[PDB]
Design an enzyme around this catalytic site. Structure first.
Site, PDB file in Angstrom:
ATOM      1  N   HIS A   1      68.825  93.555  38.317  1.00 43.89           N
ATOM      2  CA  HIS A   1      68.683  94.667  39.259  1.00 43.89           C
ATOM      3  C   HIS A   1      67.531  94.476  40.249  1.00 43.89           C
ATOM      4  O   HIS A   1      67.469  95.154  41.272  1.00 43.89           O
ATOM      5  CB  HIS A   1      68.520  96.002  38.510  1.00 43.89           C
ATOM      6  CG  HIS A   1      67.117  96.303  38.080  1.00 43.89           C
ATOM      7  ND1 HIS A   1      66.717  96.254  36.762  1.00 43.89           N
ATOM      8  CD2 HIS A   1      66.023  96.677  38.789  1.00 43.89           C
ATOM      9  CE1 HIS A   1      65.440  96.581  36.678  1.00 43.89           C
ATOM     10  NE2 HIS A   1      64.995  96.841  37.894  1.00 43.89           N
TER      11      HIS A   1
ATOM     12  N   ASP B   1      71.661  93.447  32.436  1.00 42.32           N
ATOM     13  CA  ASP B   1      70.575  93.402  33.404  1.00 42.32           C
ATOM     14  C   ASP B   1      69.723  92.152  33.207  1.00 42.32           C
ATOM     15  O   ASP B   1      68.606  92.220  32.706  1.00 42.32           O
ATOM     16  CB  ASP B   1      69.699  94.652  33.267  1.00 42.32           C
ATOM     17  CG  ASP B   1      68.744  94.824  34.432  1.00 42.32           C
ATOM     18  OD1 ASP B   1      68.869  94.071  35.420  1.00 42.32           O
ATOM     19  OD2 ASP B   1      67.872  95.715  34.360  1.00 42.32           O
TER      20      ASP B   1
ATOM     21  N   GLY C   1      58.169  98.275  38.431  1.00 44.38           N
ATOM     22  CA  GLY C   1      57.253  97.206  38.782  1.00 44.38           C
ATOM     23  C   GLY C   1      57.087  96.178  37.673  1.00 44.38           C
ATOM     24  O   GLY C   1      56.716  95.048  37.942  1.00 44.38           O
TER      25      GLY C   1
ATOM     26  N   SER D   1      59.783  95.610  35.652  1.00 42.86           N
ATOM     27  CA  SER D   1      61.152  95.116  35.499  1.00 42.86           C
ATOM     28  C   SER D   1      61.225  93.595  35.581  1.00 42.86           C
ATOM     29  O   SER D   1      60.631  92.988  36.463  1.00 42.86           O
ATOM     30  CB  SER D   1      62.053  95.713  36.584  1.00 42.86           C
ATOM     31  OG  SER D   1      62.195  97.111  36.419  1.00 42.86           O
ATOM     32  N   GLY D   2      61.973  92.990  34.663  1.00 43.40           N
ATOM     33  CA  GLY D   2      62.145  91.546  34.684  1.00 43.40           C
ATOM     34  C   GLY D   2      61.151  90.793  33.817  1.00 43.40           C
ATOM     35  O   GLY D   2      61.367  89.630  33.488  1.00 43.40           O
TER      36      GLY D   2
END
Ligand SMILES: CCC1(CC)C[C@@H](C(=O)NCc2ccc(C(=N)N)cc2)n2c1c(Cl)nc(NC1CCC1)c2=O
Ligand SMILES: [Ca+2]
Lengths: 254, 55
Positions: free
Chosen positions: A41, A90, A190, A192-193
């Site tokens: 995403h 995701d 922020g 995310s990932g």
């Protein structure tokens, strides 16, 4: 990261910062010298693919100390099953244009075998999550890398321990919950990932990816993370294949 | 065997026919003669933190 601490410089050496046009986009996890795992995403709104940069060895965003290594992202690979703007599947696999050089401050996290991860890692209660994301819901992002220790729970226990919103997305077999429902500690926008990393017998492994949640450290809710164990074979096959032209690649899943 | 306590392996575990078990390691590691332990074979193995290891 809400309610965590500064990761002492060098103790989160697999942490990746993703930038687009110089601006903080997302986190990621180095798993060898050329491959990074992040969240699909993160790439929903990117038009400027040639301006996407991964930084390794980063710690403090205000000051260059010489341990940082920047690489252009040559390819972003996303599972066919991921639908932009939604929560399932995701995950993204990024190939760097040139390998990073491993150093005291730049080291890969181990991508585990699936069986080991499902049978053993999934039952280690606590794991670390890290990033330069917001320090609080609706708050500013961090200048220094933050890290937080969170407990994993069974999805049955997640749904039962969470306050029902009704509209909220389903928690699928490709996700798991981790964190606290008292509104004190969580990962956030922020982050995310970034890595959810699990220690076992002296070594750290990638088990999750910061993915989504209801706000940040919202009372009655846990953080939701991509269940990396579901993607091990998918990732391994891709890493053994030749690169193809064009930055974005959708790859069939399974 | 592998299902229970990871077969005693430090990293990966493979089951074989009845009672037989083989432990394996991630790239950058080698298996010790005890059949379960993994030791680094490179300067920067995955999942180890150099400033703590050298500490
Ligand atoms: C995965 C796709 C997106 C697309 C906007 C992206 C994402 C998002 O904002 N992630 C950042 C984010 C990361 C961690 C957490 C946490 N641990 N509390 C919260 C937010 N996200 C999404 C969606 Cl459709 N729904 C989300 N959450 C919802 C349940 C209430 C709305 C969400 O967080
Ligand atoms: Ca810096």
């Amino acid at each position: 990261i809400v309610g965590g601490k500064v990761c002492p410089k060098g103790e989160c050496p697999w942490q990746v910062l993703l930038l687009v046009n110089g601006a903080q986009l997302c986190g990621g996890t180095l798993i060898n010298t050329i491959w990074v795992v992040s969240a699909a995403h993160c790439f929903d709104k990117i038009k400027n693919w040639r301006n996407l940069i991964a930084v390794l060895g980063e710690h403090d965003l205000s000051e260059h100390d010489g341990d940082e290594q920047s690489r252009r992202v040559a390819q972003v690979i996303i599972p066919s099953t991921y639908v932009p703007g939604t929560t399932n599947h995701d995950i993204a696999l990024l190939r760097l244009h040139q390998p990073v050089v491993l150093t005291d401050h730049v080291v890969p996290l181990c991508l585990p075998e699936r069986t080991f991860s499902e049978r053993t890692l999934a039952f280690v209660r606590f794991s670390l999550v890290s990033g330069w994301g917001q320090l609080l819901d609706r708050g500013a992002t961090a200048l220094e890398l933050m890290v937080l220790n969170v407990p994993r729970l069974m999805t049955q226990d997640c749904l039962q321990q969470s306050r029902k919103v009704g509209d909220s997305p389903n928690i699928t077999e490709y996700m798991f919950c981790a964190g606290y429902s008292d509104g004190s500690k969580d990962s956030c926008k922020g982050d995310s990932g970034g890595p959810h990393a699990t220690h076992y017998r002296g070594t750290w492994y990638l088990t999750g990816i910061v993915s989504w949640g209801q706000g940040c450290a919202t009372v009655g809710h846990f953080g939701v993370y991509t269940r990396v164990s579901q993607y091990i074979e998918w990732l391994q096959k891709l890493m053994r294949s030749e690169p193809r032209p064009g930055v974005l690649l959708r790859a069939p899943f399974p | 065997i592998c299902v229970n306590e990871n077969g005693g392996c430090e990293q990966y575990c493979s089951d074989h026919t009845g009672t037989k078990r083989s432990c394996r390691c991630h790239e950058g590691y080698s298996l010790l003669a005890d059949g379960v332990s993994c030791t680094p074979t490179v300067e920067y193995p995955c999942g180890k933190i150099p400033i703590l290891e050298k500490r």
